[PDB]
Design a protein around this ligand. Structure first.
Ligand SMILES: CCCCCCCCCCCCCCCCCC(=O)OC[C@H](CO[C@@H]1O[C@H](CO[C@H]2O[C@H](CO)[C@H](O)[C@H](O)[C@H]2O)[C@H](O)[C@H](O)[C@H]1O)OC(=O)CCCCCCCCCCCCCCCCC
Ligand code: CLA
Ligand code: CLA
Ligand code: CLA
Ligand code: CLA
Ligand code: CLA
Ligand SMILES: CCCCCCCCCCCCCCCCCC(=O)OC[C@H](CO[C@@H]1O[C@H](CO)[C@H](O)[C@H](O)[C@H]1O)OC(=O)CCCCCCCCCCCCCCCCC
Ligand SMILES: CCCCCCCCCCCCCCCC(=O)OC[C@H](COP(=O)(O)OC[C@@H](O)CO)OC(=O)CCCCCCCCCCCCCCC
Ligand SMILES: CC1=C(/C=C/C(C)=C/C=C/C(C)=C/C=C/C=C(C)/C=C/C=C(C)/C=C/C2=C(C)CCCC2(C)C)C(C)(C)CCC1
Ligand SMILES: CC1=C(/C=C/C(C)=C/C=C/C(C)=C/C=C/C=C(C)/C=C/C=C(C)/C=C/C2=C(C)CCCC2(C)C)C(C)(C)CCC1
Ligand SMILES: CC1=C(/C=C/C(C)=C/C=C/C(C)=C/C=C/C=C(C)/C=C/C=C(C)/C=C/C2=C(C)CCCC2(C)C)C(C)(C)CCC1
Ligand code: OEX
Ligand SMILES: [Cl-]
Ligand SMILES: [Cl-]
Ligand SMILES: [Fe+3]
Lengths: 340, 33, 448, 62, 36, 33, 79, 29, 333
């Protein structure tokens, strides 16, 4: 049958494995990456944001970006053949059509990559945990690049694909959402930092508990991929941390599973937080402290001090960050401390 | 053709095209001048 | 010279020179050449881009201010009168790098692989405690002599630049260096915290010259000591005696010295004259309070009774111990001392009457100059805070010097930790991993 | 004066560029080099001379 | 610089970078011998 | 040995446009406002 | 494996006979793509003299969705 | 002005040239 | 004698928690800092951190929760001055001027420094390799940066990171305004360190979990397939390599476990090292890239980029932070 014949070629043992997923993955991923490189080099953002965002305009690697469509576009798909671009490639790039081009092909690209993980794992004969662990980066991309702007007024307030544009996304969430105060991001931070901790503490432990399986100072030559014995001492590693830290791993399987659980869970928690923020359902305030502060002008915490900062960010960044609102703030209404 | 020659030539070519970009940051567009 | 025979990979290839005195000698001399090379090439570079009438700290110079501090090519106020001494220093250092570069290469790729059977005097063994202290002694004497060169320069050959010189900064000959051990070693016993500042707080050239006199004689005497003596019993049992172990001891030393240098160039304005390096952090901040005190007082403001938003004095307030200080956020910098501000300083701190009547235009010029040249700049050299727009191309030399030598000091601390840990393991015999068959833990009683 | 100064200074640069390449090649050289400590001693003693010459002729041109 | 040494102005603006090239030269020599 | 493969296409799909872009960006460094 | 080693190809004469022309030409192609000003018109990217009108301070911002293409064209005619 | 570029040319190639010369001569590399 | 018996117990490898000579200093300093921290976090009165007689409440009893609670840094009037308990006329004065903060961070940094040295010590007592303490130097350096180095460069312990959740945030926000840390490569390397670290953590964890050799049944946990102290590996590194080696391509995968785990250690430690140095170098005001008004049109008009939008945000933080502390137009300290 033609299907089994095509199947044979798709999962051929070549340099770059293709597979049935490859039909979805490789084109979508290529158009996502290639779209970003095309946009940060030539395409502008002058009509959508009133900003320069390409190398052609004089931006560098940090300031270039494929910027989001204008707020007037709403949650439009902004297809090239759509009612907005009307088949005009030039106008398409000017209306921010590249953003929805990268976000969408990138979305199906992530699907194709995870499907690749499932497909290869089945062929090799291993368990699909690497695929399962990849569900968190997907949850992050979907919640932030898709769900969040879907909750808001348009694609405009989604992240623009750029280094500085992402930094702007961070500061926006502070001033408007007070995103740091949110217990879901806090758990996300503990997942990332906790993961980096585990990553560093496991790699250093293994390297410093190695058995001597050679006589070279460079101990990398003393390992063989087909050996049966362990390359490092679990018993010695266990006693070290038991005396140093109090507790220690004694099971290699639970250990590596824990290295899966911690960062995956963390990114899943932060995704839940963003989904809330899509509806401006934030952890912005503590009511008990606002009541106290409003009644007692001598009550001050680091919480109240941060709110003053957020109000500053909002009033000072909005007229240029949201040009479609046509904000005009006279100098006298601007929130300012003394002197500064 | 020795690989170390290929890697070195390509390596020097990488440095040149990058040094041109840092050069470009101080002249023309993106120079703030 | 490969991994199978030496036991080291290519990324650790310089660790093959541990027991090869000959090639190792060539390595150090060649690296020394690189040092003297840069010291000369950069000098010539700085001089090539140098503009006489334009301040040194506005031209991104670090080496020329060092030469200038020694009294070469400068005059009253730190003004450049002759660029020729800068040229000599750059040329001589540069030419010498060819000499060190010649023997560095010779001793490395064709000099005897080992010095031990070319010469018993030059040949050495890392574990020979007598030979090591002797070499330590020789180089101790060399360091002692170098310290006396600074003394000789300051007392016999022109002198140094005194930023505290009467009538304004000028080159001054030090005739009475401080020999008092209550002063010299008094610095060494000072607190590293605010108001004290350890040895960083040295504010006169007399203490500097007199200090280098002490450390000069101490290194020479110490040099003679370690040459004639052999390590005592308590010292032999305390340290690890090997090539890598000695390296780690020096890595910890340079790391400490790196951190000390970082604080010197950032806080001290005596050995690092503000006329050359630009104002210090504390200095610039105090100058702003100085600048607007003068401006407002000219408008008719009584700066002594001017209450601020918080209730504290807007221009003038008190330190925790009662000293009259500059108000505002600069209250933290009330331990700053500079020749442009001390004329206004009385027994209880800032004298308001001296402030009202005795402030001179040169003080007003210097204040505005140092205020607008505060050590705040971006990585791409945009002067001012982060929110400042592109216009001024300026980052203070103090920032470059403080940041660079902190990065180096920290990494050399890591170097100390890395090379000392391995030196312990190697000398004990388990740096290559645990012997599968004498696993020490398995012979230990369970923790629970 | 300048006629001799700049010549000795330009030759010092050229000689150095030869020495920079020549010396390490001559050392790492298996055969072929009874040939060359003559030229090592050649350029070396000639290098020191030019340095002094330019160093002396400097005060007559600046 | 003195006007007599204005000849080597382009040469002077290159000299400081030379030490860094020695670090890169070590990799060339190692690549030449195939990282033994 | 095969000259043209799937790996071959996979390379040039990134390789060819990369050099094109690198030439373009290099030319951008000589733009005056 | 199955495919020819990269180290074998990039160190072969036949490779560099080809890529001594292909690589520089594509570099030239990209160069000409910008120097001819083709890049500007293809992607509609504003030239240094095409951002504001001579006496204009306002951003040509797209305010409508279905008349977006017409609005930009209006901006392009005015500028 | 591009005497600039001529200096870094000869200086920059001076390093690898030694390696190339010691290779064709099969020296002690 | 009873001195070497003391030295034997101190360096004893048979204690439930290893003491050691580093631990001789570590234990009292950590206990002093911990005890003081717990007490201060709950009951300490408001602290005039900015030295402007504007006390900030940080403890639970004075109107805080776990999130808003903090041990407030010492006064700006103090600056870098060493301020122990015996340098105050009373404990009431000591608490008002941010006394506890100094006692905590000083005993902590010393205890934490000895903690690192202690790690080498036990590793040397157990015949291990000693570079575990090197990996710990990265978070330790980060601690020194926000508690010591940055206060030194800025000239005040009031600008040190507060010991509190919300206080930490305040430290971060003000930092961005005055240094543009996001546009600094060292923090970007640090983000790459922790993002990459988390990635490689989840990566190595999932690939080993997938290669676990079947030793258990359907009705029991797979973790029981590994018994503590066994000599043979519990997973198939060859199968793992063949999976990941096909996920990307073969030579992008590690076949050497020792080389693999070294990469797992190297990447985050190096990344955190730089972000530690980032805070440490920005302590001397070597700030992140300033690309404000970098793009200009033919006439001269400023064509904004995303950096200009970032700048507008920094302006908001700048003019609002410490709203009563500044009397002069420039923020130098
Ligand atoms: C091995 C032995 C270890 C022993 C450890 C236990 C002993 C404690 C060591 C110090 C610990 C840090 C204390 C704070 C250091 C500091 O605030 O240092 C500041 C002082 C300078 O202080 C300043 O000194 C100034 C001196 O300038 C004065 O005098 C000048 C004269 O020109 C000018 O006139 C100027 O205007 C005037 O103010 C003033 O006194 C200021 O008030 C004062 O703040 O520098 C100095 O003492 C230099 C010495 C300290 C260098 C910094 C150390 C950094 C270590 C980093 C560790 C990283 C760990 C990583 C692990 C992974
Ligand atoms: C497989 C790869 C793949 C995938 C999944 C996508 C997916 C997408 N592309 Mg992309 N694209 C791809 C490859 C792919 N593209 C390639 C290779 C190129 C280069 C030529 C492009 C070029 C491209 C452009 C230029 C654009 C997109 C856009 C899009 C989006 C809109 C597409 C759309 O509306 O299609 C609609 C059509 C289909 C989905 C086809 C459905 C066909 C059905 C199944 C036939 C059914 C027949 C029926 C059973 C017969 C019954 C007979 C009888 C019984 C009655 C979407 C996210 C747009 C975008 O993102 O705009 C912002 C856009 O402008 N793509
Ligand atoms: C200690 C500091 C710290 C830490 C550790 C974190 C940690 C985190 N933050 Mg938080 N944050 C912080 C401070 C911190 N934050 C502060 C102070 C603020 C200011 C309020 C913010 C503001 C903030 C925002 C606004 C957001 C986060 C988010 C996150 C999460 C990002 C996860 C991630 O890797 O996404 C990275 C992205 C992905 C994993 C998606 C998939 C990416 C694909 C796989 C990339 C493919 C690349 C391709 C193959 C090749 C491209 C090549 C090309 C580049 C050349 C994570 C939980 C995000 C979140 O919550 O998301 C749910 C988010 O949107 N933070
Ligand atoms: C400061 C830098 C420095 C220095 C001084 C040295 C010095 C040395 N290394 Mg080391 N090395 C370094 C950096 C350095 N290395 C770095 C960064 C790496 C990592 C890539 C290595 C990796 C490495 C390895 C893997 C090995 C060495 C070895 C050696 C020794 C023998 C080299 C040899 O025979 O080369 C032969 C090379 C040549 C003959 C080519 C020419 C070399 C010369 C020096 C060029 C001089 C150029 C200069 C312009 C000449 C000016 C002349 C005059 C005008 C002044 C030598 C003592 C070897 C060793 O230990 O042997 C026992 C060894 O196996 N090194
Ligand atoms: C770190 C310094 C150092 C040391 C310890 C050695 C040690 C050695 N060299 Mg080497 N050498 C060095 C630097 C050094 N060299 C340099 C920089 C050069 C380039 C000029 C050479 C060039 C060189 C050659 C060409 C030869 C040696 C040889 C030798 C051996 C015999 C030396 C002898 O008999 O000296 C005797 C010297 C004296 C009795 C007096 C020397 C006085 C000096 C030059 C100046 C003293 C004043 C003061 C210290 C100068 C300081 C300058 C600056 C640092 C401030 C020995 C293994 C020989 C060898 O190994 O043969 C097989 C050999 O042929 N060396
Ligand atoms: C480069 C400098 C240098 C070096 C590397 C050495 C190295 C050595 N010396 Mg020598 N020495 C030097 C300079 C140096 N010395 C000089 C210049 C003198 C003249 C004053 C001496 C006088 C001297 C004597 C008299 C002795 C040595 C001895 C030793 C050996 C043991 C050192 C030891 O245990 O230290 C470690 C020191 C201790 C463990 C003691 C406690 C040190 C405290 C904790 C220092 C605290 C410093 C503080 C944190 C910061 C400084 C500020 C302030 C408090 C001072 C060793 C071979 C000993 C030996 O065996 O000789 C044969 C010996 O008896 N040296
Ligand atoms: C076969 C494979 C061939 C390669 C395929 C590669 C595919 C992936 C492409 C990745 C693109 C990476 C970013 C390119 C940046 C660029 O081109 O800058 C191009 C810019 C152009 O520089 C700008 O030019 C302008 C012209 O008007 C102005 O002159 C500006 O002032 C000037 O700064 O250069 C820089 O900004 C500085 C150098 C680049 C700094 C990059 C830092 C490193 C980023 C790494 C991120 C991960 C990448 C992983 C890659 C593996
Ligand atoms: C040496 C070059 C600079 C190294 C910086 C520090 C890197 C290693 C730090 C490890 C800390 C983790 C905890 C201990 C982890 C641990 O214990 O490691 C164990 C691992 C095992 O090596 P061996 O014990 O066999 O070798 C030790 C010696 O005997 C030499 O063989 O050590 C190394 O591989 C060191 C390799 C250094 C040489 C390669 C360094 C590559 C650095 C790349 C720099 C990139 C710069 C650009 C960045 C933007
Ligand atoms: C859009 C679109 C599309 C697409 C297209 C494409 C896909 C393109 C691509 C393009 C591309 C694909 C491009 C590429 C580029 C690349 C580049 C541009 C690169 C660069 C690089 C660099 C720059 C590097 C750097 C560095 C690093 C990173 C490392 C080392 C160091 C250095 C710095 C050197 C189509 C038509 C389909 C359809 C329509 C729409
Ligand atoms: C061992 C080894 C190594 C290293 C080596 C080295 C490091 C060397 C060095 C070398 C050197 C360190 C050299 C130097 C040289 C120098 C010179 C050669 C100089 C010259 C000068 C001049 C020529 C001057 C001139 C002039 C005058 C006279 C006046 C002014 C102006 C002018 C500039 C014109 C390596 C790693 C690579 C590898 C192998 C092993
Ligand atoms: C003083 C003087 C002089 C001298 C000079 C010199 C001494 C020079 C040297 C120079 C040098 C000494 C150079 C070197 C260079 C080197 C290089 C430029 C290298 C590069 C490398 C690379 C690029 C690599 C790459 C690679 C490989 C191959 C492996 C790994 C991977 C990679 C791809 C990274 C003369 C005579 C002129 C006269 C005037 C004055
Ligand atoms: O204390 Mn904490 O935050 Ca360092 O900048 Mn100035 O001072 Mn105050 O203002 Mn911004
Ligand atoms: Cl604040
Ligand atoms: Cl103020
Ligand atoms: Fe593992």
């Amino acid at each position: 049958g033609w299907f089994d014949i095509l199947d044979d070629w798709l999962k051929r043992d070549r340099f770059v494995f293709v597979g049935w997923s490859g039909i979805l993955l490789f084109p979508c991923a290529y158009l996502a990456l290639g779209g970003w490189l095309t946009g940060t080099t030539f395409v502008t953002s002058w009509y959508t944001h009133g900003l320069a965002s390409s190398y052609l305009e004089g931006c560098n690697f940090l300031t270039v970006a494929v910027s989001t469509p204008a707020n007037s576009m709403g949650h439009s798909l902004l297809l090239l053949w759509g009612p907005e671009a009307q088949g005009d490639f030039t106008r398409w790039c000017q209306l921010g059509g590249l953003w929805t081009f990268i976000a969408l092909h990138g979305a199906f690209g992530l699907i194709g990559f995870m499907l690749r993980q499932f497909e290869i794992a089945r062929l090799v004969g291993v368990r699909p945990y690497n695929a399962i662990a990849f569900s968190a980066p997907i949850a992050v991309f979907v919640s932030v690049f898709l769900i969040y702007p879907l909750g808001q007024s348009s694609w405009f307030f989604a992240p623009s694909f750029g280094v500085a544009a992402i930094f702007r996304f961070l500061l926006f969430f502070q001033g408007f959402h007070n995103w740091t105060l949110n217990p879901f991001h806090m758990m996300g931070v503990a997942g990332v930092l906790g993961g980096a901790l585990l990553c560093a503490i496991h790699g250093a432990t293994v390297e410093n508990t190695l058995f001597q399986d050679g006589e070279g100072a460079s101990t990398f030559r003393a390992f063989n991929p087909t050996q049966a014995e362990e390359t490092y001492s679990m018993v010695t590693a266990n006693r070290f941390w038991s005396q140093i830290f109090g507790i220690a791993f004694s099971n290699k399987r639970w250990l590596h599973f824990f290295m899966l659980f911690v960062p995956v869970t963390g990114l899943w928690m932060s995704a839940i937080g963003v989904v809330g923020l899509a509806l401006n359902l934030r952890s912005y305030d503590f009511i008990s402290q606002e009541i106290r502060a409003a009644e007692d002008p001598e009550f001050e915490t680091f919480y109240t001090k941060n709110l003053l900062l957020n109000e500053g960010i909002r009033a000072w960044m909005a007229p240029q960050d949201q040009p479609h609102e046509n904000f005009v703030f006279p100098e006298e209404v601007l929130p300012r401390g003394n002197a500064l | 053709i020795p690989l170390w020659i290929v890697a070195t030539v390509a390596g020097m070519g990488v440095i040149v095209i990058v040094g041109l970009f840092f050069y470009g940051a101080y002249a023309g567009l993106g120079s703030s001048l | 010279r490969d991994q199978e025979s030496s036991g080291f990979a290519w990324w650790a290839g310089n660790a093959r020179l541990i027991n090869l005195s000959g090639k190792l000698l060539g390595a150090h001399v060649a690296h020394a050449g690189l040092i003297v090379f840069w010291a000369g090439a950069m000098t010539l570079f700085e001089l090539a881009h140098f503009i006489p009438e334009k301040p040194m700290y506005e031209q991104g110079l670090i080496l020329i201010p060092h030469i200038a501090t020694l009294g070469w090519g400068v005059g009253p106020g730190g003004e450049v009168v002759d660029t020729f001494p800068f040229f000599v220093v750059g040329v001589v250092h540069l030419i010498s790098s060819a000499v060190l570069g010649f023997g560095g290469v010779y001793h490395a790729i064709r000099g005897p692989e080992t010095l031990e059977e070319y010469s018993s005097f030059f040949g050495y063994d890392w574990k020979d405690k007598n030979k090591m202290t002797t070499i330590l002694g020789f180089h101790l004497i060399v360091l002692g002599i170098g310290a006396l060169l600074l003394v000789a320069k300051a007392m016999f050959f022109g002198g140094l630049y005194d930023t505290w010189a009467p009538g304004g900064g000028d080159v001054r000959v030090i005739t009475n260096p401080t020999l008092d051990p209550r002063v010299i070693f008094g610095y060494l016993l000072k607190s590293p915290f605010g108001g004290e500042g350890w040895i960083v707080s040295v504010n006169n050239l007399e203490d500097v010259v007199g200090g280098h006199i002490w450390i000069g004689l101490i290194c020479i005497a110490g040099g003679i000591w370690h040459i004639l003596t052999t390590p005592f019993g308590w010292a032999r049992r305390a340290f690890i005696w090997s090539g890598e172990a000695y390296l780690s001891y020096s890595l910890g030393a340079l790391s400490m010295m790196g951190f000390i240098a970082t604080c010197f160039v950032w806080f001290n304005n005596t050995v690092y004259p503000s006329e050359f390096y630009g104002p210090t952090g504390p200095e610039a901040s105090q100058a702003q309070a100085m600048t607007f005190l003068i401006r407002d007082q000219k408008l008719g403001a009584n700066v002594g009774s001017a209450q601020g938003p918080t209730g504290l004095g807007k221009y003038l307030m008190r330190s925790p111990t009662g000293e009259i200080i500059f108000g505002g956020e600069t209250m933290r910098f009330w331990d700053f001392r500079g020749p442009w501000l001390e004329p206004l300083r009385g027994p209880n701190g800032l004298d308001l009457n001296k402030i009202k009547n005795d402030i001179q235009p040169w003080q007003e010029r210097r204040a505005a100059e140092y205020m607008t040249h505060a050590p705040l700049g971006s990585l791409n050299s945009v002067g001012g805070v982060a929110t400042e727009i592109n216009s001024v191309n300026f980052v203070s030399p103090r920032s470059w010097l403080a940041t660079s030598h902190f990065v180096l000091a920290f990494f050399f601390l890591v170097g100390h930790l890395w090379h000392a840990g391995r030196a312990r393991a190697a000398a004990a015999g388990f740096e290559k991993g645990i012997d599968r068959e004498s696993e020490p833990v398995l012979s230990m009683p369970s923790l629970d | 004066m300048t006629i001799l100064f700049q010549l000795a200074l330009a030759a010092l640069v050229i000689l150095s560029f030869v020495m920079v390449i020549g010396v390490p090649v001559a050392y790492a050289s298996p055969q072929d080099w009874d040939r060359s400590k003559q030229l090592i001693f050649l350029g070396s003693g000639l290098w020191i001379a030019l340095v002094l010459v330019v160093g002396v002729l400097n005060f007559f041109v600046v | 610089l003195p006007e007599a040494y204005a000849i080597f102005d382009p040469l002077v603006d290159v000299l400081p970078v030379i030490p860094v090239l020695f670090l890169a030269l070590a990799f060339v020599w190692q690549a030449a011998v195939g990282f033994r | 040995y095969p000259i043209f493969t799937v790996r071959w296409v996979a390379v040039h799909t990134l390789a060819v446009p990369t050099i094109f872009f690198l030439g373009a960006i290099a030319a951008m460094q000589f733009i005056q406002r | 494996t199955g495919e020819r080693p990269f180290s074998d190809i990039i160190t072969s004469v036949r490779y560099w006979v080809i890529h001594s022309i292909t690589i520089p030409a594509l570099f030239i192609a990209g160069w000409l793509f910008v120097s001819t000003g083709l890049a500007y018109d293809v992607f509609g990217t504003p030239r240094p003299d095409s951002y504001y009108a001579q006496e204009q301070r306002s951003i040509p911002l797209v305010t409508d969705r279905f008349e977006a293409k017409q609005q930009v064209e209006t901006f392009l005619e005015q500028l | 002005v591009i005497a600039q570029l001529t200096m870094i040319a000869m200086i920059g190639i001076a390093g690898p040239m030694i390696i190339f010369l010691l290779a064709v001569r099969r020296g002690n590399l | 004698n009873l001195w070497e018996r003391f030295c034997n117990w101190v360096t004893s490898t048979d204690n439930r928690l290893y003491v050691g000579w580093f631990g001789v200093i570590m234990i009292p300093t950590l206990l002093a800092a911990t005890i003081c921290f717990v007490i201060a976090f709950i009951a300490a009165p408001p602290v005039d951190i900015d030295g402007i007689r504007e006390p900030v409440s940080g403890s639970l009893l004075y109107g805080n929760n776990i999130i808003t609670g903090a041990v407030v840094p010492s006064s700006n009037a103090i600056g870098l001055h060493f301020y122990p308990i015996w340098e105050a006329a009373s404990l009431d004065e000591w608490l008002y001027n941010g006394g506890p903060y100094q006692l905590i961070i000083f005993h902590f940094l010393l205890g934490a420094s000895c903690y690192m040295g202690r790690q080498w010590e036990l590793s040397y007592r157990l015949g291990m390799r000693p570079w575990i303490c090197v990996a710990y130097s990265a978070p330790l350096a980060s601690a020194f940066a926000v508690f010591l180095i940055y206060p030194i460069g800025q000239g005040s312990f009031s600008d040190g990171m507060p010991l509190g959740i919300s206080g930490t945030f305040n430290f971060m926000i003000v930092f961005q305004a005055e240094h543009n840390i996001l546009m600094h490569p060292f923090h970007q390397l640090g983000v790459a360190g922790v993002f990459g670290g988390a990635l490689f953590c989840a990566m190595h964890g999932s690939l080993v979990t997938s290669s676990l050799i079947r030793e258990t049944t359907e009705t029991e946990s797979a973790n029981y397939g590994y018994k503590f102290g066994q000599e043979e590996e519990t997973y198939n590194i060859v199968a793992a390599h063949g999976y990941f080696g096909r996920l990307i391509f073969q030579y992008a995968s590690f076949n050497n476990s020792r080389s693999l785990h070294f990469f797992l250690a190297a990447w985050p430690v190096v990344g955190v090292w730089f972000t530690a140095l980032g805070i440490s170098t920005m302590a001397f005001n070597l700030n992140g890239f300033n690309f404000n008004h970098s793009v200009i049109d033919a006439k001269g008009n400023v064509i904004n980029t995303w950096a200009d939008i970032i700048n507008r945000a920094n302006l908001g933080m700048e003019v609002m932070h410490e709203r009563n502390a500044h009397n002069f137009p420039l923020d130098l300290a």
